Amino acid sequence: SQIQFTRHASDVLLNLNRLRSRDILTDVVIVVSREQFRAHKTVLMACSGLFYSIFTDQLKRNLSVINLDPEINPEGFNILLDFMYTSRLNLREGNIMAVMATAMYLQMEHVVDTCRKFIKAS
Amino acid sequence: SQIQFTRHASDVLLNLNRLRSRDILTDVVIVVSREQFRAHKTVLMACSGLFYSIFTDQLKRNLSVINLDPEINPEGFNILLDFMYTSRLNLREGNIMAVMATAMYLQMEHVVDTCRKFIKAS
């Protein structure tokens, strides 16, 4: 019976992306081959089965650096990190295979399914 | 021209609330009179002008305990902390004045405006 604010979740994510853009309270650096990406672990956990499984473990929760599998494409990861913070996915014919593979690795099922839909329409 | 996921922002907030419920990566305790509330600073910053102004300051950014003004009602704060993590506001005749006052203090303008609308309809 509570009052529903339709734009609050979107507004919160926009503010989290703004915080990431200014490196404010970022607590992890994700290393993908020769590239690095700072992020908030909470957002990563909220968006990825891989990161959720990592940081819910007390063994790994305080890690400040995570090195991804060497085969992961940095642009593919960048596209998915942007998606986590914006709800928008930059899928193109030139990046679909890399994004889909990276989404599988990050355990983002709805993204992978969407990639399968993009392939089906192309 | 990116693909839009209409439910991702909502889903992310739900996962952040789930993380708060298990005290996973909470980094601040908010003390309100005789009560304490653990939260994520990033979410607080994303939702409150007060908390944004606090944690964007390097002087205060690493504070693990924030004591609110003694006049703040703990239930009023609890209602607003729940709103930050769910987009749902539990406004009732028995709590409107306390919630509105607390929202003013936390600098949550759209909430305050909504409280003014609740008063106007009551």
Ligand SMILES: C[C@H]1COCCN1c1cc(NC(=O)Cn2cc(-c3cc(Cl)c(O)c(C(N)=O)c3)c3c(=O)n(C)cnc32)c(Cl)cn1
């Ligand atoms: C365990 C659940 C259920 O019971 C209550 C607790 N609860 C929970 C889960 C949390 N994190 C994740 O689920 C991590 N996680 C996020 C996505 C995810 C999320 C969003 Cl929002 C998306 O948009 C997309 C997408 N478009 O692919 C994907 C995702 C996933 O897909 N797979 C296959 C596996 N793990 C995933 C947390 Cl942090 C707290 N509680």
Ligand SMILES: C[C@H]1COCCN1c1cc(NC(=O)Cn2cc(-c3cc(Cl)c(O)c(C(N)=O)c3)c3c(=O)n(C)cnc32)c(Cl)cn1
């Ligand atoms: C400075 C802005 C603009 O330029 C780019 C950077 N940018 C920004 C702002 C951030 N945080 C806040 O705005 C903190 N903040 C959140 C709300 C807020 C947010 C949501 Cl989502 C709500 O639903 C409601 C509500 N219902 O009352 C209120 C709010 C507010 O109301 N007032 C009056 C003052 N400060 C507020 C961050 Cl973290 C990063 N960047």
